[PDB]
């Protein structure tokens, strides 16, 4: 039974701590950040586990407090602190991370969203031995899943929040037993998952419909893909692509009925299916065309 320190803050971290508390290893302390108590903090308290909340590991006091725990391992999931070398090396077996991609692809902050946005055929979780640098450490275990045509960043997050803990616990048993194997990442295949933004989520109708459709899924739940019509910002919750040679200016409404609002793009047609008018829950387009048939008249051009 490893003496484990768990470090992490939001729900994705809490799922891993929960799995560890129902396991064989001793959780001797939890490190987390405030938001309000984090979900990680609340779980720790329910199990009478000491909670530490440093702002960073710059002070000698912070490094010493960690050292005095005599940890065998620190497991780090969705924890915002930079861990310097000395901290990485404080636990007897170092620090392991659960990262939400198939490393070395999508190092960094937005791996779930970017895997979907780029149209990867699969993604997964990597259990990584943390080293100095952004997500550069050796890979101990990878678990993969297909990205389904219906997957959003929400639905994929939900799957990886289950897969991550399962993979972690399997990897931890390998470590405990002395059977883990580290694989060095190849830098030449690495890239970085840059954060999302409201500005990038504005639809450019000159893009390929396939690309807009991946955005619509990747940018759910945040920021939501959006376009402008009349004087309003409409959020797109669901769409599909229709393979159809385009002969009209991108943004032109080609067809508008219960089956879709069909919009010309730079390649193929984007069929809007569920839209959110400011104020209101997202509606099927059948309902949108009842209310505001005027904004989506055939032959008019969306911006």
Swiss-Prot record:
Under the heading HAMAP family, the entry gives: Formyl_trans
Please name the NCBIfam families in this protein's record.
Answer: fmt
Task: Name any Gene Ontology BP term.
Answer: conversion of methionyl-tRNA to N-formyl-methionyl-tRNA
Origin species, per record, is: Vibrio cholerae serotype O1 (strain ATCC 39315 / El Tor Inaba N16961)
Function, please? Attaches a formyl group to the free amino group of methionyl-tRNA(fMet). The formyl group appears to play a dual role in the initiator identity of N-formylmethionyl-tRNA by promoting its recognition by IF2 and preventing the misappropriation of this tRNA by the elongation apparatus.
Q: What keywords tag this UniProt record?
A: Protein biosynthesis, Transferase
Report if keyword Protein biosynthesis is assigned.
Answer: yes
Enzyme class, one word?
A: transferase
The chemistry this enzyme catalyses reads: L-methionyl-tRNA(fMet) + (6R)-10-formyltetrahydrofolate = N-formyl-L-methionyl-tRNA(fMet) + (6S)-5,6,7,8-tetrahydrofolate + H(+)
For the ligand ((6S)-5,6,7,8-tetrahydrofolate), the binding residues are 101-104
Q: Decide whether keyword RNA-binding is in the record.
A: no
- Would you identify the family this protein belongs to, as annotated? Belongs to the Fmt family.
Kindly give the InterPro entries that the UniProt entry links to this protein.
Fmt, Formyl_trans_C, Formyl_trans_C_sf, Formyl_transf_N, Formyl_transf_N_sf, Formyl_transferase-like_C_sf, GART_AS, Met-tRNA-FMT_C
Query: According to the lineage, what is the superkingdom?
Result: Bacteria
Entry GO terms, CC: cytosol
Name-wise, this protein is Methionyl-tRNA formyltransferase
Q: A Gene Ontology molecular-function term?
A: methionyl-tRNA formyltransferase activity
EC no. given is: 2.1.2.9
């Amino acid at each position: 039974s490893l003496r484990i320190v768990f470090a992490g803050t939001p729900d994705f971290a809490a799922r891993h701590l929960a799995a560890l508390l129902s396991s064989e290893h001793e959780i001797i302390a939890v490190y987390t950040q405030p938001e309000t108590a984090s979900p990680v903090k609340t779980l720790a308290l329910e199990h009478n586990v000491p909670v530490y909340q440093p702002e960073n590991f710059k002070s000698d006091e912070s490094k010493q407090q960690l050292a005095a725990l005599n940890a065998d391992l620190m497991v780090v999931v969705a924890y915002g602190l930079l861990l310097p070398k000395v901290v990485l090396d404080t636990p007897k077996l170092g620090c392991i991370n659960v990262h939400g991609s198939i490393l070395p692809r999508w190092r960094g902050a937005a791996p779930i969203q970017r895997s979907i946005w780029a149209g990867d055929s699969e993604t997964g979780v990597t259990i990584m031995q943390m080293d100095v640098g952004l997500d550069t450490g050796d890979m101990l275990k990878i678990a993969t899943l297909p990205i389904e045509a219906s997957d959003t960043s929400a639905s994929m997050y939900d799957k990886l929040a289950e897969l991550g803990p399962q993979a972690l616990l399997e990897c931890l048993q390998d470590i405990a037993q002395g059977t883990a194997v580290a694989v060095k990442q190849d830098d030449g295949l690495a890239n970085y998952a840059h954060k999302l933004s409201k500005e990038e989520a504005r639809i450019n109708w000159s893009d390929a419909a396939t690309h807009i459709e991946r955005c619509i899924r990747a940018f759910n739940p945040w920021p939501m893909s959006h376009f402008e019509v009349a004087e309003n910002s409409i959020k797109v919750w669901q769409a599909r692509v229709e393979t159809r040679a385009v002969t009209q200016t991108p943004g032109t409404i080609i067809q508008a009925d219960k089956s879709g609002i069909y919009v010309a793009t730079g390649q193929d047609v984007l069929v809007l299916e569920s839209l959110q008018i400011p104020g209101k829950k997202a509606l099927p387009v059948q309902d949108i065309l009842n209310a505001r048939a005027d904004w989506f008249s055939v032959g008019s051009q969306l911006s």
